[PDB]
Design an enzyme around this catalytic site. Structure first.
Site, short mmCIF file in Angstrom:
data_model
loop_
_atom_site.label_atom_id
_atom_site.label_comp_id
_atom_site.label_asym_id
_atom_site.label_seq_id
_atom_site.Cartn_x
_atom_site.Cartn_y
_atom_site.Cartn_z
N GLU A 64 80.20 30.54 0.86
CA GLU A 64 79.40 30.18 -0.30
C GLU A 64 78.87 31.31 -1.21
O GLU A 64 78.86 31.11 -2.43
CB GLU A 64 78.28 29.20 0.10
CG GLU A 64 78.82 27.85 0.59
CD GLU A 64 79.49 27.95 1.95
OE1 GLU A 64 79.02 28.76 2.77
OE2 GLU A 64 80.51 27.25 2.22
N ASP A 77 85.79 30.38 6.25
CA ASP A 77 84.56 29.60 6.37
C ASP A 77 83.38 30.40 5.85
O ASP A 77 83.53 31.58 5.53
CB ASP A 77 84.36 29.26 7.85
CG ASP A 77 83.20 28.35 8.09
OD1 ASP A 77 82.89 27.51 7.20
OD2 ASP A 77 82.57 28.48 9.17
N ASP A 123 80.59 20.46 7.52
CA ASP A 123 79.80 19.95 8.64
C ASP A 123 79.32 18.53 8.44
O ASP A 123 78.16 18.31 8.08
CB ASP A 123 78.62 20.88 8.91
CG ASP A 123 79.06 22.27 9.28
OD1 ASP A 123 80.17 22.39 9.81
OD2 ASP A 123 78.29 23.23 9.05
#
Ligand SMILES: C[C@H]1O[C@H](O[C@H]2[C@H](O)[C@@H](O)[C@@H](O[C@H]3[C@H](O)[C@@H](O)[C@@H](O[C@H]4[C@H](O)[C@@H](O)[C@@H](O)O[C@@H]4CO)O[C@@H]3CO)O[C@@H]2CO)[C@H](O)[C@@H](O)[C@@H]1N[C@H]1C=C(CO)[C@@H](O)[C@H](O)[C@H]1O
Ligand SMILES: *[C@@H]1O[C@H](CO)[C@@H](O[C@@H]2O[C@H](CO)[C@@H](O)[C@H](O)[C@H]2NC(C)=O)[C@H](O[C@@H]2O[C@@H](C)[C@@H](O)[C@@H](O)[C@@H]2O)[C@H]1NC(C)=O
Ligand SMILES: *[C@@H]1O[C@H](CO)[C@@H](O[C@@H]2O[C@H](CO)[C@@H](O)[C@H](O)[C@H]2NC(C)=O)[C@H](O[C@@H]2O[C@@H](C)[C@@H](O)[C@@H](O)[C@@H]2O)[C@H]1NC(C)=O
Length: 827
Positions: free
Chosen positions: A416, A413, A512
């Site tokens: 980015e 997770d 999300d």
């Protein structure tokens, strides 16, 4: 107040001789502009056929090498070595033409229909239509037939439609921005689009991929599409199709075939940010069992770590010994365990991982020193996944952790990479302050916002500016490598941030999202999009990640989500709990729909095999099966699982019906074979959809091999096979079944520990024959798989061994590994 750019002229151009034709041109800048910075004066331009179905157009600085995605990251064939120059191949449907205008142009058209696929001819008084090529601004534009061209892709963005709406800007810059936000650039970048033409020749489809990892805006106005890219080169691939499936085959041949998934990964997953201790996650597992709701994999979010540090366990709430016990018990019950990892490593002197990271110099640097971010444990340094040393470090950290705690997969997770702070820009740097601002977060937000600054440096003196969009993708490669080195099973990983090619390594989820009816529907275009992106293992957090869910929304969401390729209930910590057993209406729906999903496990698994083989998505748009039906192009609220199974969810609060599009023909409910829709032409049908029901139909002409319901996938695989045969008056019915041990690393490999079965069914006037062909009989035989029952739908007369009716042939005791031919007579 200058024009943005003045364009290029062809100075020379030839098609090579005696070789697989390629065109080489030299282009010279017409006139300079100060807008968006320095223009490249000389361009090397090449068009070449890397395959008969794939055209590559590469535009580089004739006098300097520029950033390109490293071949080691995304391996691909190397480059080739008025007046027009034309490139065409006898076996290619693609024709390339270079127009020696001022400024110059180029087009690609279909030989077979003369449809112009990509048209980069400039309108000479409109610089927005020009090829412009500055150090930090590349502009490439194509006209499109507004009404004929139907575009899909250019991820990652949340959209209420699957087909791209006219008049929008799509920004590609990996960012920790929640997918509950429409339009905004999200965690991944996939500069690919599919273009389905309604005419000439309905359903004629091609693909367009710009192999570039820099930030970009893509402006789509219906009759035009323009890339505005802030670095790198133009390396453009056109995929000829002409079917949508061929396009994805061609595209995934270039970027990587979808990784296979283990059989267990198609079971139901449960996660929550906020689980308090081992006792709570044990309680969740127990209560799923008590509700008789299938649960395959239990996950732990960052709660399990000691103060949010990777590779640690909270000594108080998740002690190693109790976690070891918990996982062991999962494994004894046929269940699995997946924990989360973040990429940032906490700058903590007592922390072993940090120590070994510093010793191996694995962290991304800025101004010569490790770049300091902020994430869940506070201050962090970020492993440079472009660095082989960092990848070895990552493998080692995972091996050490696995040595103490058995895990079955990894969730990566925040990659980015996400940063909770935004650093100040380097004074005078045009990387931190680019001359063209892409539409980051929908507000032209500086690209450094909440990530690693562009001036940070990677292995090989690569700037974050250039390599940013590759981070998640690189962590996925390193993580799959770590899993493969620490277990001989087919690995499972889930990644948030992705780039084109990530599907070769990892599953993805939509991120999300929110507990909103909007997001329930949004999960469908994103699921379909990721199939086009070569990432077929896709799903959304069931019942919604952010905000508190409701009984009704969660009930309609498990109904839908039970059919995602990747099916997981996950939720944020500041919301109510949303395990499926908490409401009876949700729990009852869950049993019904996960019941059917689990019976479809052999089918999902076979689709996963097809996806690895051909790139064809498990969850696919209706127009993949019906490309000649233009009504399916605009559909965004229904999808197919495989060729002939259609899911039509309720997506509105208080609705007890759904207006669903049915392609021509006969469709049968998988929940009640007596219930059918028969349409002489494709049309909308108002389906009954009671609170506890979701519409799922199978089309005539298809055969699906099912197994029985069970609480675990292992138990499901121990049940008899039931074959569902849906006859068509118009075509023989066919289907496929791929079988192996569920965890082989080289799926369908030369070891031959797999079997492929093909099913066929055809009606005569007085009889009906059902048959199979088997590849690798001995293997399937050795696994004792038995087909005990065949159900025959689609006929209006009952059938037996030597309005629509249902015929069932029982007690067959047929080995799946032995080919059969069953002959039936009409009553
Ligand atoms: C759990 C989650 O936490 C972080 O994300 C949060 C974020 O910190 C919140 O502030 C909130 O942010 C929203 C914001 O409220 C909303 O207004 C919108 O902002 C828009 C704005 O409206 C618009 O005008 C324009 O300015 O753009 C803004 C966005 O750029 O959207 C914001 C989010 O983009 O909500 C989010 C999501 O809850 C953190 O960044 C997330 O990564 C994090 N989720 C992670 C963490 C986990 C814990 O390990 C996992 O459980 C989870 O699966 C994983 O995805
Ligand atoms: C270095 O690791 C320490 C041990 O894991 C961290 O301290 C722990 O932080 C927890 C909060 O996440 C807290 O409940 C624990 O009691 C505490 N453990 C000990 C032995 O103090 C430490 O985290 C920092 O210090 C604590 C007190 C909090 O202020 C955190 O927010 C801090 O980040 C780690 N240090 C750093 C710089 O992350
Ligand atoms: C499966 O779908 C069938 C088609 O809608 C249902 O049959 C219908 O049942 C109605 C009574 O609830 C009846 O008015 C309709 O005429 C009848 N239609 C046909 C074509 O038979 C079927 O419903 C029943 O199932 C159980 C509840 C029994 O009542 C049976 O007699 C019916 O077949 C649906 N099956 C189920 C289990 O819901």
């Amino acid at each position: 107040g200058e024009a943005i750019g003045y364009g290029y002229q062809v100075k020379n151009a030839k098609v090579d001789n005696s070789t697989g034709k390629s065109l080489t041109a030299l282009l010279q800048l017409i006139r300079n502009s100060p807008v968006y910075g320095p223009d490249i004066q000389f361009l090397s331009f090449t068009a070449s056929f890397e395959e008969d179905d794939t055209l590559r157009i590469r535009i580089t600085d004739a006098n300097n090498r520029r950033w390109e995605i490293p071949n080691e990251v995304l391996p691909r064939p190397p480059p080739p070595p008025p007046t027009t120059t034309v490139l065409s191949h006898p076996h290619s449907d693609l024709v390339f033409t270079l127009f020696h205008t001022t400024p110059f142009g180029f087009t690609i058209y279909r030989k077979s229909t003369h449809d112009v696929l990509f048209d980069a001819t400039p309108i000479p008084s409109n610089p927005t239509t020009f090829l412009i090529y500055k150090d930090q601004y590349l502009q490439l534009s194509s006209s499109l037939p507004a009404q004929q061209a139907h575009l899909y892709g250019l991820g990652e963005h949340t959209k209420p439609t699957f087909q791209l709406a006219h008049n929008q800007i799509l920004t590609l810059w990996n960012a920790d921005i929640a997918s509950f936000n429409r339009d905004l650039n999200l965690y991944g970048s996939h500069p690919f689009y599919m273009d389905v033409r309604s005419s000439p020749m309905v359903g004629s489809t091609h693909g367009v991929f710009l192999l570039n990892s820099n930030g970009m805006d893509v402006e789509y106005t219906g009759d035009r599409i323009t890339y505005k890219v802030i670095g790198g080169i133009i390396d453009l691939y056109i995929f000829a199709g002409r079917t949508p499936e061929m396009v994805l085959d061609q595209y995934t041949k270039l970027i990587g075939r979808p990784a296979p998934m283990p059989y267990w990964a198609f079971g139901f997953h449960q996660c929550r940010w906020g689980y308090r201790d081992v006792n709570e996650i044990e309680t969740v597992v127990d209560k799923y069992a008590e509700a008789r709701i299938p649960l395959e994999v239990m996950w732990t979010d960052i709660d399990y770590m000691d103060a949010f540090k990777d590779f640690t366990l909270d000594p108080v709430h998740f002690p190693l010994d109790k976690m070891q016990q918990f996982v062991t018990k999962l494994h004894r019950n046929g269940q699995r365990y997946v924990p989360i990892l973040d990429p940032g490593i906490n700058t903590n002197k007592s922390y072993g991982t940090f120590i070994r990271g510093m010793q191996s110099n694995v962290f991304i640097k800025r101004d010569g020193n490790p770049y300091l971010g902020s994430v869940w444990p506070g201050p962090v340094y970020y492993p440079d996944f472009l660095d082989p040393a960092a990848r070895s470090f990552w493998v080692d950290e995972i091996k050490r952790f696995r040595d103490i705690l058995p895990i079955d997969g990894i969730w990566i997770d925040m990659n980015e990479a996400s940063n909770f702070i935004t650093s100040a820009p380097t004074p005078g740097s045009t990387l931190d302050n680019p001359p063209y601002k892409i539409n980051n977060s929908g507000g032209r937000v500086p690209i450094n916002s909440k990530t690693i600054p562009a001036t940070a440096m990677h292995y090989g003196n690569v700037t974050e500016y250039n390599a940013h969009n590759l981070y998640g993708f690189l962590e996925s490669q390193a993580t799959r490598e770590a899993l493969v080195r620490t277990s001989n099973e087919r690995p499972f990983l889930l990644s948030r941030s992705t780039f084109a090619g990530s599907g070769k390594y990892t599953a993805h989820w939509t991120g999300d999202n929110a507990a909103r009816w909007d997001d329930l529907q949004y999960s469908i275009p994103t699921m379909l999009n990721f199939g086009l992106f070569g990432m077929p293992m896709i799903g959304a957090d069931i019942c919604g990640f952010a905000e508190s869910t409701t009984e009704e929304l969660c009930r309609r969401w498990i109904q839908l989500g039970a059919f995602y390729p990747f099916s997981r209930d996950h939720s944020a910590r500041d919301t109510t709990h949303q395990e499926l057993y908490l409401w009876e209406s949700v729990a009852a729906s869950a049993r019904t729909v996960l019941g059917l999903r689990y019976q479809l496990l052999p089918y999902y698994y076979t689709l996963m095999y097809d996806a690895n083989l051909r790139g064809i998505p498990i969850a696919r748009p209706l127009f993949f099966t019906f490309p000649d039906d233009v009504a399916t192009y605009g559909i965004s609220s229904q999808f197919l699982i495989g060729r002939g199974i259609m899911v039509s969810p309720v997506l509105q609060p208080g609705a007890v019906s759904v207006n669903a599009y049915f392609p021509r023909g006969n469709w049968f409910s998988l929940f009640n074979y007596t219930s059918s829709v028969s349409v002489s032409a494709g049309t909308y049908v108002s389906l009954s959809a009671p609170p506890d029901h979701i519409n799922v139909h199978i089309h005539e002409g298809n055969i699906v091999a099912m197994q029985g319901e069970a609480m675990t996938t292992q138990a499901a695989r121990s049940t008899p096979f039931h074959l569902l045969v849906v006859m068509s008056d118009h075509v023989a019915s066919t289907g496929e079944l791929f079988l192996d041990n569920g965890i082989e690393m080289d799926i369908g490999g030369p070891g031959g520990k797999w079997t492929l079965v093909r099913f066929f069914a055809e009606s005569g006037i007085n009889n009906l024959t059902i048959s199979s062909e088997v590849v690798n009989r001995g293997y399937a035989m050795s696994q004792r798989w038995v087909m005990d029952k065949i159900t025959i739908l689609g006929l209006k007369r009952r059938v037996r061994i030597k309005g629509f009716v249902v015929s069932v042939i029982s007690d067959l005791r047929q080995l799946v590994g032995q080919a059969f031919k069953l002959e039936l007579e009409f009553e």
